[PDB]
Subunit: 157 residues, 6 copies
Amino acid sequence: MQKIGIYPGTFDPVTNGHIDIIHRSSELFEKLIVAVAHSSAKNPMFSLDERLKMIQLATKSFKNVECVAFEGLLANLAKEYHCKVLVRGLRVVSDFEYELQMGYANKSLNHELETLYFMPTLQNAFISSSIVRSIIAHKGDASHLVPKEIYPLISKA
Amino acid sequence: MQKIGIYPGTFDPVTNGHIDIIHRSSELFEKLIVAVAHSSAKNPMFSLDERLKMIQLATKSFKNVECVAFEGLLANLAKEYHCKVLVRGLRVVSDFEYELQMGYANKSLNHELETLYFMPTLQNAFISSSIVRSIIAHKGDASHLVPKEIYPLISKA
Amino acid sequence: MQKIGIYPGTFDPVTNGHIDIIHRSSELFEKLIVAVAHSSAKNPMFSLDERLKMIQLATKSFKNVECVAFEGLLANLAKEYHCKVLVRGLRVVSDFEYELQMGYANKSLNHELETLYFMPTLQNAFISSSIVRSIIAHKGDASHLVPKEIYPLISKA
Amino acid sequence: MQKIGIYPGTFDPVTNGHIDIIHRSSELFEKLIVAVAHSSAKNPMFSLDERLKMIQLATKSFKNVECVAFEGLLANLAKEYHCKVLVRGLRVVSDFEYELQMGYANKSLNHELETLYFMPTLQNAFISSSIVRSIIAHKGDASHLVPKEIYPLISKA
Amino acid sequence: MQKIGIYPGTFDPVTNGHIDIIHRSSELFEKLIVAVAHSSAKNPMFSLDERLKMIQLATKSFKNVECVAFEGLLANLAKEYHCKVLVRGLRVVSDFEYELQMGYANKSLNHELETLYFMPTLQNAFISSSIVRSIIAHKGDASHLVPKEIYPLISKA
Amino acid sequence: MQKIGIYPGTFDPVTNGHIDIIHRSSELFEKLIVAVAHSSAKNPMFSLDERLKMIQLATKSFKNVECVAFEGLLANLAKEYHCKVLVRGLRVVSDFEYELQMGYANKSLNHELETLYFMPTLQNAFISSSIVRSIIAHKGDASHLVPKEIYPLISKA
């Protein structure tokens, strides 16, 4: 169980919140796959190329963290990694009941697959990508909210 | 982080929901301490001694699980174990914001101490100790909601 | 299913919100039993005898409505009536998840027993017995929140 | 009141959850109209033709259930059927407060029109069409979640 | 602090709810700016021209209320008015946790800028523009829900 | 409306969250009365006399703030002050619907009496008096959560 975790997300863009979850989750599992989704149905502010490059950039410090692009069924992806744990992050603005539903859905699709929830630090409990996207879209300063090594990446387009 | 995790609660009484969380969380740590709080202020149905004996008997199959009763602050008990990880469960009727708050209060008191959330099985996502107390006070069959190895011990007293 | 429905509660005291639910739900069943629970554990403001008399007096205009006080499990009382339908109300301050849970607990104990939810009138969507108890304990005018035929009986004792 | 109920929905697609609500609601009313909406503002996965055919298919067993297409004001539709009850379904992921608002809105538009809420079975409390649409859109197995007689219908496009 | 408040909104369209908030807020501040946003990302039913004209029309009675169009960062707008208070409105259907997040976001962007929340009257607690838009979009009567002086404005297109 | 505002509560004990709300709300009224309710029914940890003395000592720096203890209905105490505005705080763990309800109950009892909501500082959005009582009952360090000028007075008794 503790061999491999998968942390799925749009990461549109990667926040301090997400980095906190990758730090805590990467410490508990021998390996963490960060799975960067297409979120086509979502019309993401950043392209997959930008989103993968920011999250690769922001995670270079964690030696056991691999970043892949994924356009598929999360349950299936875990199957092909022989992964028994989806990592998910909980914040003040979480649709908690929706998170549980997704946890139960993924386990019905893959009977080996459990979901484990982490918290960001208190400083980051009120960060969501949606906030970060508003501040960006409204030409505000988002530099407090995202890792400094990606702010260049994100501040142009 | 993987050496020790603490699953605290009042366990008044331990439910099949709790047993799911012990089973899954125990898989992720080398040792899992089940920490049963006096919780005098809550006026629990079962004595601290009863609650410890019930969870002891329910966890006897999990060889890396150990059961303690404690009188103090939880954040001080994790520091005594050099525990950096608290395990909690998340249910349909959880007060999600309050779990967050408790996570952040536990951190502010012990700055090495994170909180990790597990889910019970779908069949048990609707159990709460509070609905088990109603059934027991009203002399209903709670047998379906708790581990059988405690059911003899609850039904009388 | 249409022969009998049971509207259970503590009714400490019956409110104008409750009266809306009796009026609407009574229209849908040939007989509606108002089942007033002892609820000893909740420490109700009014005695079980007081609560029964108040709702009896408030429902005297509804000819297919009958009022019972009960000590036991609700799921066992519906089986004694061959009742397959529980009536509950939904309010702005309802604990929605807990109503669901109670619905599912009532089913697991009596597998013929579904739960149906009605709404009070908009004017009363903000009443709870709990806000009526505050007003009565603080000697405010609760006259606007409860049926007048009980208002003489509440204000003193 | 008990003569006719209307159960409105997009039914994109019909789930086991929806079938449960049609079963329980059809047992209480002499007749149930299932009203299949355009949900143009919603950009539905299935066309009205597919959505009406699945719900007609899935409800053939219930003799008192009629399925119509409707592109109009729900309050008006009830008026033209002389209907005094909108049937709605409640699940763990429901926006409860939004459901109440819609109940009060419909009654302000049609002063005869009350809303009654049913639960699916526990096995189905965590099903929503949105889940079913994700699993479908992500080429997963949705066969556990929808009536088997429509799975062919839905599994192509 | 009490010199100037800003009340931002899409006002798509202005409701009795919004008028209540403008009444109460305008009584507390020497001056109230109503800031009418583009909500481009929102695809508003009414154009800025219609939305500004309705809110100017509906607020002519309040002598200290000015209406401006704004396509920018709320934090910056307050800075240029030397404003220390964002006025926001709370209703039964509010995403409360999202409102707090926005309050904290705006203060991180402008360290002088606090958020103050008003209630509409009980008669209006269940009004949201989204309801009003549905009723309008569905050719229903919305005349109870919006100030009568704008109903002409809004009832054509 | 700006002449007097009343910030009611049980303040068992006053927290740094409360102090933020006093500081911000006091800026907006010529006089702010902190009204400490007996709240006998709630069984508060600290005596009404203790709670008054603690908040008196915590507010001594705010020259337009005054502290009263009251036994009655809050809506009757505002009428005695000719107070048209109640001040409340909103927190991550607030029961938002219940605050609304209380707002509407206070209005129905005193029809001049509106409710205005302030937020504490981000650092304090996670404090509740209820989490401070847990810490004090469990002999933890609450020093970080309450004003120091009361910390000598809480820790013993």
